[PDB]
Design a binder for this molecule. Structure first.
Ligand SMILES: O=C(O)CCCCCCCCCCCO
Ligand SMILES: O=C(O)CCCCCCCCCCCO
Ligand SMILES: [K+]
Ligand SMILES: [K+]
Ligand SMILES: [Zn+2]
Ligand SMILES: [Zn+2]
Ligand SMILES: [Zn+2]
Ligand SMILES: [Zn+2]
Lengths: 373, 373
C-alpha cells in the first residue's frame, strides 16, 4: 500500500526565522487526498509575509510554498480522476465543484475545505507532516516547499504531461492572478487605457493580460525604474516613476490620459496606492482592481463621490480562475505561446538555497526564483 | 420676440432660512437655451441639503428645485428640436449627445456644461434670474422652484403630451435615480437577493426597481419603522431596524441571507452605512451601490479583503440614465403602468406653502410633496 515517506522539506520552525531543510515524514494519502512529488517551486510575497510573523493567521511550525508543480506519487481512497504519474499543479484555491461558490459562475472561491486549510490541516482535521516528533502544519492547502506534499483531491489541477514544471509552477499563483485580474475581473475591452501599479511578477502578468486583451495603452507605475525595462518587454507602452512627480500619482495619470484610465490594477498590497489606483480611473466608467494583498488591519478609503461619478472598485483572488478547470487551460496557453511564463523566471536555485529566494525577493532584484527540489 | 418675464419664485437668499416667495424677473432664452413654465415641482433631500447650508459648495442667493415638469414657454436662438407648448422635464444631468461621455454607453454623466452649472450659471456664464436688483443663481441647471425657469437646451427631456405633470415631475430625480440604480448600475438578475438602506423616495424607487428586475428577497433597512409599511407595498419582502440588533447591521444581514445579499443600495448619504452596505454583500459576487443623494464631505472605507474576496463597490448618479433619451421612456413606462409614480406622492401643497414641503421632509413624515405652481 502507500507507505510513509521520509524526505526533505524546508520547515519554517518559527516566524521571523529563515527556512530550515529538515528530514520529515509525509504520511500516505487518506481518503480523497493525493500525495504529490514536488519537482519545482517558487517563492511568492505571500510566503514571505507569513514567514515574517506579520500574518495574524500564520501558525508554526509549518511548511510554506504555494507555487509548485509536480507529479502525483499516489492517491487515497475514493480518488479516480487522478493517478500516480499524472502531471499536476497544487491549488491553494480548490474547486470541489459542488459548493455554493463553485456552482456560481461569478466566483472561484470554493469554500469546501477553507476552515481546515486555514488551520494548516487536511479536510479530516489532521496534518500529514511530522518532523522530529512534532506535527508540522500545511500551508494554503499546498505546502510546496517539500519533496512530497499531500493535498485535498479538490486542490489538484491535472496538466499537460509535456509542460516544463520548472516553469509552469509559476502558474500556481503569480502569473495566473495577474493574468486573470485583467481578463477575468476587469474583462477589459480592446483599445482600453490601463495603469498597473507595482511591476513585480503579478504586475507583469497584468500587463501581459492587458496586451492579450488588446489594450491601446498600458502605463506601468513603480518607484523602482529598474523594473521598467521588463514591464515594457511584457507590453507596457510606457512607465512612470511616482517620485518623478510633485503631485498625487492619480493626478499625473489623469492628466496623462485626459481624464483617467479605463482600468487600473494595484499589484502591491499598499492601501494608499489602492486609493490612488481608484482615483486615477476615468470618471464615469473607470474600474480599479485590487490584486495585491494588504497587511491585516489596513483599510482602503476614498470619497464616495468617486463611486457616484462612475468609478468601480473591484478585487480578485487568483485571477478569478475556477482553479481545477482553468489551470490546465492556462498551461495549454503557455504551451501554445499565447501567454508567457519563462519570461518571469529571473533566477534559479537548488532546494538547499531556498532562503536566497526569499532574500532575492526582499532585495527586489528578481521577479521569480524557481527552486529545483 | 421673447420678453422679460415677471413672475413668482421661491428664493433662497441665505442658508438655514426659509425660502422667500419673491417676485423676480426671468430673462428670455439666449442661444441654445429654453424657458420653461414650471407646472409642478417637488422637494428632494438634496434641495434641503443645500438650503441647510451643510453643503460646502452651496451658493446663495439661489432658486433651488430639480424635480419639476412643465411646458416650454419659448426657445432661444438655434433651438430647433423644442418649441413653445412642448411637454418637458428639466434635467440636472444633461445629454449633449456629442462629448466623450454622452458617446460612451457606460455612463450618463455629460460634462458639456458641468462647470457653469456647478456655479449656478447657464453655459454662457450668466444667470437669467434677478430679484430686487440682485442676480439670483440657478441650481443644478434646473431651478424648478419658479413659475418660469431657463435651462440649457441640452437639459431638456421632451415627454408624452398626456403625462400628468403633477406626477411625472418626480421622475426628475428621486424615482428615476433609485429605479435606475437597480436596473442600470446594478443590473441585478432575476432571483437576486437585495438590501436597501434608507427607505425614503429613493429607496422605495430602488425597491421598485428590484421588483421589476425580478428580485427574490428585498430587505428594507431603516431606523424609522414608520417607513416599513410603504416599503412592503413597494415590494420589500421584509424590513429590519438596525436598532433592534446589537451586532453591526452587516452581520445581521449576512446571517439572514446565509452569506450576505447579492446587491445592496445605500440611499442615505451616510459613509458609515455605505461601509455596512458593502460588507453586507455576499462574498464572491456581492455588489453594493452608493446612490448619489449627498456630497457627504467625508470618506468611505473598508478592508481591501472585502474586494479581494469578491465584493464590488459602485455608485450612481440619476440612476445612470442618459437623461434626454431615457426620461421620456421612463414617463412612458409610468404611463404603461410598468413603474409607479403616484404612490410616491404623500402630500400636495400650493407654491406659497413650499416651505411646508421642507418641514414634512425633515420630520421624515413624508416621501414626496408635490408643489403646485
Ligand atoms: O476562499 C477564501 O475564503 C479566501 C481565499 C483567499 C484568496 C485571497 C488571496 C490572498 C493572497 C494569497 C495569494 C497571493 O499570494
Ligand atoms: O459632476 C458630474 O459630471 C455629474 C454629477 C455627479 C453628481 C451626482 C448627483 C448627486 C446630486 C444630488 C442628488 C439629486 O438631488
Ligand atoms: K469590462
Ligand atoms: K449584474
Ligand atoms: Zn501567492
Ligand atoms: Zn467548491
Ligand atoms: Zn454630453
Ligand atoms: Zn435629487
Amino acid at each position: 500500500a502507500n507507505e510513509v515517506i521520509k524526505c526533505k522539506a524546508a520547515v519554517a520552525w518559527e516566524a521571523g526565522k529563515p527556512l530550515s531543510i529538515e528530514e520529515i515524514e509525509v504520511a500516505p494519502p487518506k481518503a480523497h487526498e493525493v500525495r504529490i512529488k514536488i519537482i519545482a517551486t517558487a517563492v511568492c510575497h505571500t510566503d514571505a509575509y507569513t514567514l515574517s510573523g506579520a500574518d495574524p493567521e500564520g501558525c508554526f511550525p509549518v511548511i510554506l510554498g504555494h507555487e509548485g508543480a509536480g507529479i502525483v506519487e499516489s492517491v487515497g481512497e475514493g480518488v479516480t480522476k487522478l493517478k500516480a504519474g499524472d502531471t499536476v499543479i497544487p491549488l491553494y484555491i480548490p474547486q470541489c465543484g459542488e459548493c455554493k461558490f463553485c456552482l456560481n459562475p461569478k466566483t472561484n472561491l470554493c469554500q469546501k475545505i477553507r476552515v481546515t486549510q486555514g488551520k494548516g490541516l487536511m479536510p479530516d482535521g489532521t496534518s500529514r507532516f511530522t518532523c522530529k516528533g512534532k506535527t508540522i502544519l500545511h500551508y494554503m492547502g499546498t505546502s510546496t516547499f517539500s519533496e512530497y506534499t499531500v493535498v485535498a483531491d479538490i486542490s489538484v489541477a491535472k496538466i499537460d504531461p509535456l509542460a516544463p514544471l520548472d516553469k509552469v509552477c509559476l502558474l500556481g499563483c503569480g502569473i495566473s492572478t495577474g493574468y486573470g485580474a485583467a481578463v477575468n475581473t476587469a474583462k477589459l475591452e480592446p483599445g482600453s487605457v490601463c495603469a498597473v501599479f507595482g511591476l513585480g511578477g503579478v504586475g507583469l502578468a497584468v500587463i501581459m493580460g492587458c496586451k492579450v486583451a488588446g489594450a491601446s495603452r498600458i502605463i506601468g507605475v513603480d518607484i523602482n525604474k529598474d523594473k521598467f525595462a521588463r514591464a515594457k518587454e511584457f507590453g507596457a507602452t510606457e512607465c512612470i516613476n511616482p517620485q518623478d512627480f510633485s503631485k498625487p500619482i492619480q493626478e499625473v495619470l489623469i492628466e496623462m490620459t485626459d481624464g483617467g484610465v479605463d482600468y487600473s490594477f494595484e499589484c502591491i498590497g499598499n492601501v494608499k496606492v489602492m486609493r490612488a489606483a481608484l482615483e486615477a480611473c476615468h470618471k464615469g466608467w473607470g474600474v480599479s482592481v485590487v490584486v495585491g494583498v494588504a497587511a491585516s488591519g489596513e483599510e482602503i478609503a476614498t470619497r464616495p463621490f468617486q463611486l457616484v461619478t462612475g468609478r468601480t472598485w473591484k478585487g480578485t483572488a487568483f485571477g478569478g480562475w475556477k482553479s481545477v478547470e482553468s489551470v490546465p487551460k492556462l498551461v495549454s496557453e503557455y504551451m501554445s505561446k499565447k501567454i508567457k511564463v519563462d519570461e518571469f523566471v529571473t533566477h534559479n536555485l537548488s532546494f538547499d538555497e531556498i532562503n536566497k529566494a526569499f532574500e532575492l525577493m526582499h532585495s527586489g532584484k528578481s521577479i521569480r526564483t524557481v527552486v529545483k527540489i
